[PDB]
Design a protein around this ligand. Sequence first.
Ligand SMILES: CCCCCCCCCCC(CCCCCCCCCC)(CO[C@H]1O[C@@H](CO)[C@H](O[C@@H]2O[C@@H](CO)[C@H](O)[C@@H](O)[C@@H]2O)[C@@H](O)[C@@H]1O)CO[C@H]1O[C@@H](CO)[C@H](O[C@@H]2O[C@@H](CO)[C@H](O)[C@@H](O)[C@@H]2O)[C@@H](O)[C@H]1O
Ligand SMILES: CCCCCCCCCCC(CCCCCCCCCC)(CO[C@H]1O[C@@H](CO)[C@H](O[C@@H]2O[C@@H](CO)[C@H](O)[C@@H](O)[C@@H]2O)[C@@H](O)[C@@H]1O)CO[C@H]1O[C@@H](CO)[C@H](O[C@@H]2O[C@@H](CO)[C@H](O)[C@@H](O)[C@@H]2O)[C@@H](O)[C@H]1O
Ligand SMILES: CCCCCCCCCCC(CCCCCCCCCC)(CO[C@H]1O[C@@H](CO)[C@H](O[C@@H]2O[C@@H](CO)[C@H](O)[C@@H](O)[C@@H]2O)[C@@H](O)[C@@H]1O)CO[C@H]1O[C@@H](CO)[C@H](O[C@@H]2O[C@@H](CO)[C@H](O)[C@@H](O)[C@@H]2O)[C@@H](O)[C@H]1O
Lengths: 470, 470, 470
Amino acid sequence: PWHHIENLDLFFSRVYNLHQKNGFTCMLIGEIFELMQFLFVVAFTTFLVSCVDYDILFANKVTLPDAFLPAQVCSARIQENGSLITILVIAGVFWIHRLIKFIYNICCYWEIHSFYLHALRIPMSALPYCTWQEVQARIVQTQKEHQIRELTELDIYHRILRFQNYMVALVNKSLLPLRFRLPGLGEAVFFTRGLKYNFELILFWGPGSLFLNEWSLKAEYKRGGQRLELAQRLSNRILWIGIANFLLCPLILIWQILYAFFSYAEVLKREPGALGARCWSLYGRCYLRHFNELEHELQSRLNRGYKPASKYMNCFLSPLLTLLAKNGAFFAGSILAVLIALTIYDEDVLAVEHVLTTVTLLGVTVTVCRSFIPDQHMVFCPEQLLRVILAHIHYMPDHWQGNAHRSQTRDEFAQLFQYKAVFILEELLSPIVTPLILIFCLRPRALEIIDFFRNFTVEVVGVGDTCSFA
Amino acid sequence: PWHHIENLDLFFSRVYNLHQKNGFTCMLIGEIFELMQFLFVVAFTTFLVSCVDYDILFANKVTLPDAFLPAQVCSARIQENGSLITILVIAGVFWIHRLIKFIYNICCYWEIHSFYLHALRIPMSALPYCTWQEVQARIVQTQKEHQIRELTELDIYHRILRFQNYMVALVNKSLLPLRFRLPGLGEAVFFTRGLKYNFELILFWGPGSLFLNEWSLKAEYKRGGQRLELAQRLSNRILWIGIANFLLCPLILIWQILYAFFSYAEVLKREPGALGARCWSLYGRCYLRHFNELEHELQSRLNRGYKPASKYMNCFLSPLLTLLAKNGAFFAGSILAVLIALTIYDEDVLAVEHVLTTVTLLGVTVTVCRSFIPDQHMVFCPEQLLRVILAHIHYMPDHWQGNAHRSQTRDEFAQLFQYKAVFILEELLSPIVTPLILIFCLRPRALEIIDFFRNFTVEVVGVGDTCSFA
Amino acid sequence: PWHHIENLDLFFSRVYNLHQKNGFTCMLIGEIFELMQFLFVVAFTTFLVSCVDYDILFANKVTLPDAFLPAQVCSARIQENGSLITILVIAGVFWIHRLIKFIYNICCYWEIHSFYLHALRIPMSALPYCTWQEVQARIVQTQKEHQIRELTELDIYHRILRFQNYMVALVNKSLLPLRFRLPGLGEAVFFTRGLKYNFELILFWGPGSLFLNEWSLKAEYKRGGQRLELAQRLSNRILWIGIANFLLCPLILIWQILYAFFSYAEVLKREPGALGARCWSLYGRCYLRHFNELEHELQSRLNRGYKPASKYMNCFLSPLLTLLAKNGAFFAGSILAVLIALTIYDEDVLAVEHVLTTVTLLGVTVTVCRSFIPDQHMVFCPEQLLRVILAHIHYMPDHWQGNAHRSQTRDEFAQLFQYKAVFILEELLSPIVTPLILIFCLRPRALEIIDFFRNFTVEVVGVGDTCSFA
Ligand SMILES: CCCCCCCCCCC(CCCCCCCCCC)(CO[C@H]1O[C@@H](CO)[C@H](O[C@@H]2O[C@@H](CO)[C@H](O)[C@@H](O)[C@@H]2O)[C@@H](O)[C@@H]1O)CO[C@H]1O[C@@H](CO)[C@H](O[C@@H]2O[C@@H](CO)[C@H](O)[C@@H](O)[C@@H]2O)[C@@H](O)[C@H]1O
Ligand SMILES: CCCCCCCCCCC(CCCCCCCCCC)(CO[C@H]1O[C@@H](CO)[C@H](O[C@@H]2O[C@@H](CO)[C@H](O)[C@@H](O)[C@@H]2O)[C@@H](O)[C@@H]1O)CO[C@H]1O[C@@H](CO)[C@H](O[C@@H]2O[C@@H](CO)[C@H](O)[C@@H](O)[C@@H]2O)[C@@H](O)[C@H]1O
Ligand SMILES: CCCCCCCCCCC(CCCCCCCCCC)(CO[C@H]1O[C@@H](CO)[C@H](O[C@@H]2O[C@@H](CO)[C@H](O)[C@@H](O)[C@@H]2O)[C@@H](O)[C@@H]1O)CO[C@H]1O[C@@H](CO)[C@H](O[C@@H]2O[C@@H](CO)[C@H](O)[C@@H](O)[C@@H]2O)[C@@H](O)[C@H]1O
């Protein structure tokens, strides 16, 4: 590929994304699936609402296609529902918008698919078996062939990760709200995934934002006098985008409930210790992140620190919770063992009214409670394995060096390394909470955001306008 | 709490028990559960015996409350059963005796709940997150405030554990029987949990025992001439308590069978490798115990030595047992795989007569046999990982230093680290065996018990009459 | 046992086999089982074909013995099937041949059962708890008692393993074919278990082979002139044995399909991650084998190298396979979670037509796909844990010292450490492929086989004719 390309940020970000998606054809059949996964969840849940007759399926030998309605009625009953057509049109417009954007990506990743072949000499077979240090070093020393002088291996880092080094400095300085006292829990920590998307939509995307192009910001934000007129323009902007989150609040809420039922409700019956496992929260991914550190380099420490940190949390379980788990598993296991031994004896105490759903619900009640009960012979693991976690993730809040066994070291660590089911809970609440905390919580901090981009923005001569901390 | 308390043994034992039950309100809602767990097992098994009509439940659409009898017949059919009323009265008298004793404990632990707050400055929130070295050091250096001179940190150990340092010396000297040749197994080792309770009821509880109070013993047992008249008083005493175990034998036997069915019979269907796991036996807990070593300090080595010792036993499995397990799992898995593939084909070979209980019983037959089969790729673990177990539990019988692979190192170690299902078996046999071995086996050793408390009882000036070995 | 035995190879091979089968009575009840396991698979699958009436079992309250036919019809319908009688006679002749050979082994292992008792002083109780270094040293220093002069501890190794040191040198020199390009996979590696049996039937068993007795070979194969007349005798011999594999091809094919259904088809429903586990292939067992190294000494490194090598293969999983596994588990788990939550709601959407087999087949579809999905938090294990595997298994093909992350280090290692399900696949194909590659692939290599036994056969004065490499 060719002489003096127009955008060295969107180019290098797609060179990196092609390597991490393990090739062109793997990313292509990958991103087909999420367009099909959106289309499956919307079309199958619309068929369940309108076109399955449950009176035949519940009460009234019957076959499984006897419940289903014919296609001349399947397409008819769906249309005298003005709410559901309004759901299907706005879902349909968003989907064809996501279909146009995908065809635009195939034309653009094919030009970088040919960058590996014809300029870096790396096939799509050898590409999942290269590291990034392979792919990066091909770009650096072949710059005599393609212009695209002696940049650095560092100046490719500032271009792939320019707008990620701002979210590191906005979280470490608490210029984004991220934490709220509510009565009942204490100090809760927000910053879910749909909230981080808005923070760059306030700050980095569009003509009316900062950053007129993707590599330099406005000249407005470097002049002084503290410019409350310039800080006011950001202040009403969070309104018009925050009102947009409030009007689109009911339709993102429908999507998060549908997606959680289709991807977690069967895992509840089999293995509810899966949802009792923990995962590094998005607040923790922005707290343990370094400056100019790629997305696969963050994960290489967050997989190595997963194994100690998941057993650090297991040796702090609540005495009141374990005690309710052991005696709740006794009372449910005792009526199971009566019903289990009564089914083995005669096998006709099944098909009496509620017995088969009672074994199903008591069997998952016992399965939940066995997850809450820790290991009986759990080595209580002298609680400076926190110096093993500090070797992998490199930031501890400094109160934790000798106080590793308290509750001001256990409750602050669960803000970084939350449950899986709390992560499920914060994604369903996310359409509700996000327009409230942009309007009421982010707008008072607008004068410190505008002053942040004045004082900490350093222009480096090759890359452009970077964060000062990075 | 106040000046010169009357009983420094029962006080310090409850200071320790309040810390290990993780607080007042955790122990309170804890001990409510065992009063409810006794009341659940007795009332639910009485309802199953007398008030469920199984002819409607087995043979004669039916609902699950159609089997149950109405309350005017539920309370009527229970009374023309003179055995069951006799069961319910003696269970009822024992339960209200256990209810009076619990209300007496709330009044006494509340006085020690206020000892943490108003004398040690430790709340109930900070208490599960303290160690005993926290709680002990609060008691030691605040003795200028409360009298309760410069005792030691050692003299609190002799008071919490006075009657546990005797059971260490009575087991290590074999003054308690604990081992019996029966034809068929070899030398079996008893000492279950209801037997250890009686040994302190012969020796430490009551006015007619030794130890007139809880901290000093009689003057009778220090005089000499070997006192067969004094050894006779113990000899008929084991009769009157051993006859009491024989008369109360049928009602403790009913309780152990009921409790094992309500807490282990559903674990058989799911996971019978749970009952093939091993646990440190009560003979092992008194054999590996040190002198003046608290109950949580014994468990801290018995959890660290659990992980090597459970895989030391897995690399000694019987060749005759593995061979019957592999070929028994073939013959049962082959008729499963016919019946599994015959259910997938048509799904109406269910609801023909015994097929669904056959899949249930062959499925647990295969599940039992897969537990008996060891790992195919089991590293045969060079059998001096016995020097890893010796690091955690500190006593080996000295034959085992180089002979770690024989059967006189495997069968003596399973006396310390028995199966779980053998522990189940020794609790059901425990009402049967215990009155027999007090009358016939303990009474011949009464002259050596009386001479033991003459020769090994040292009076220390702060604590009182302690064991000489401790 | 007595003076100057006639065959020191078959004696020492049975002294070793008695130790590895853990005794006389363990081997006796062991080898009864495989005669019963052959008889179970043949008789139970014959009853399923001819004597179960499925029209009563599928469509037409019924009992499970109502499907079965009476014995006067059970023995009648089996006889108007000229294919099945031909199957049962040839299975019956092979079984009574395997029954005569077993009674001949009881008479011969009893003479070596008395060799442990009356000449080595080792009972059958102490025998599973001895090592081979116990059993070998008993034979070596008691040679003053039994003649059976100062042989070596090495000269017992050449006698137990004489015909196994040839198969090491025939595989390392590629005088046996073992590898074939087919379009679609690349270079595949054969050498299944029924193929290795034939290679010693061409070379070591019979009067018409090499090795006139079990300890010395013919004088024919040491003379020179390259002897194409002598290489022709081997060339037509592989025909007459290869035609025998082709005529007996349909009846060994029936046995491998029957045995795989009776021992793996129920493991598919429970745990299909079992068949996704890997096992050291038979090509790998002959590639990592040393010279004069016993069968239990090979396994002691292949169990220690099992644990790193099974996680070396898990960190090379295909990006296209993981991506189809995650999105296939979404689409199947979403229709499960609808059907699971629809059964909990009413419990009468069971017994509508195909729902219960749909939960069964989608439940195993999700279970298969969760096996293909790797660990999310898998430490990517810096790929020179290949220096941990090289410590246990002692041969690496030398391209792998620094190239541990490519596909020419992953695909050559799966030839040594193949899947379990590929091992299942190569045993069902084994009756088909084996007569083809003896006739068409082994006969062109006959002149290099005849020249191999001329140049590499060294006569040692105690043992006889051994391989030169060993
Ligand atoms: C001015 C107006 C403001 C506009 C409002 C903004 C509110 C955003 C809502 C859009 C929304 C719901 C759409 C529902 C459609 C409703 C239509 C009707 C439906 C029928 C009634 C899209 O849809 C999401 O649905 C999720 C499933 O529900 C998917 O799963 C997810 O993955 C699973 C596997 O790991 C997990 O389980 C789990 O992680 C998820 O579940 C997501 O992949 C998918 O993007 C949620 O937005 C999401 O978009 C993505 C970008 O692709 C954003 O990621 C960004 O990526 C980088 C980018 O720079 C940056 O690094 C960073 O910025 C950010 O990480 C997210 O931040 C998030 O915001
Ligand atoms: C002169 C006359 C002699 C009197 C006879 C003495 C015979 C003793 C029998 C009383 C009995 C059966 C009562 C049945 C009631 C029948 C009424 C009718 C019922 C309806 C027909 C009580 O009941 C027990 O029932 C058990 C369940 O069945 C409970 O589970 C248990 O925990 C589970 C969780 O780990 C486990 O699974 C498993 O470990 C158990 O299962 C026990 O907690 C409970 O105490 C068994 O006695 C038991 O009492 C306890 C003390 O509380 C004793 O512990 C002591 O504690 C310290 C104390 O100093 C000392 O350290 C030490 O001494 C000792 O450790 C035991 O030794 C034992 O003896
Ligand atoms: C001139 C003419 C040539 C003759 C043709 C030769 C073709 C050989 C076919 C005979 C055959 C099928 C017989 C079916 C009977 C059909 C009758 C009608 C049936 C009704 C229609 C026997 O039957 C086998 O059936 C298998 C199950 O199907 C068994 O399971 C196995 O174990 C399971 C547990 O680990 C596993 O899961 C799995 O490993 C198997 O599955 C075997 O144990 C059993 O031997 C397959 O042969 C086998 O025999 C054995 C020797 O005993 C051979 O082992 C040898 O041992 C040493 C010896 O020196 C040497 O070290 C070496 O040489 C070799 O290792 C094998 O090499 C193999 O060849």
